[PDB]
Design a protein around this nucleic acid. Structure first.
Ligand SMILES: [Ca+2]
Ligand SMILES: [Ca+2]
Ligand SMILES: [Ca+2]
Ligand SMILES: [Cl-]
Length: 98
DNA sequence: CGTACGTGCGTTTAAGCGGTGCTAGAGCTGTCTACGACCAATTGAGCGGCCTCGGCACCGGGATTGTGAAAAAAAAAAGCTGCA
């Protein structure tokens, strides 16, 4: 024993995004806990529906297109437009880096 | 207390029905290869742990903000009649 086991989180990232969006504001541990719950919630919803989609169409593979269709299903209007936008942009940029 | 909405009637409308003809496209098969799993070697990003100091929570004691009472006033209204 002697050292507690490692429990992953999105904290470093939530913080990274925080400095982008507001360089001089911090975040309490409870607030960070809510953010981590948030990310995990949504991960699970999007992956979940992506999972159904693939299975509903007899595909073994969850691709970027299943994420997109799921994102359209789970987010409301404006949020989904921008979400699909950022998702599209990111995959683009990522294939350019090769 | 006033009328909206239920009831019942005569007239009008088009749903449903049974059928026929045409064709998009659902869904299957066979081929072929790009891509994702799986691997072993490599290494850097993120883990837990720990220290510092700055943000925020307290606290007190001063200023603004609404509420309720009481009063004035206004203003109505109520009770009652003159006079035409
Ligand atoms: Ca086809
Ligand atoms: Ca392919
Ligand atoms: Ca830490
Ligand atoms: Cl993909």
């Amino acid at each position: 024993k002697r050292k507690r086991s490692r429990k992953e989180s999105y904290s470093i990232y939530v913080y990274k995004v925080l400095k982008q969006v507001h360089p001089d504001t911090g975040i309490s541990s409870k607030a960070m806990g809510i953010m981590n719950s948030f990310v995990n919630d949504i991960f699970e919803r999007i992956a979940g529906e992506a999972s159904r989609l693939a299975h509903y169409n007899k595909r073994s593979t969850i691709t970027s297109r299943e994420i997109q269709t799921a994102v359209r299903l789970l987010l409301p209007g404006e949020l989904a437009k921008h979400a699909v936008s950022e998702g599209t942009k990111a995959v683009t940029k990522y294939t350019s880096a090769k």
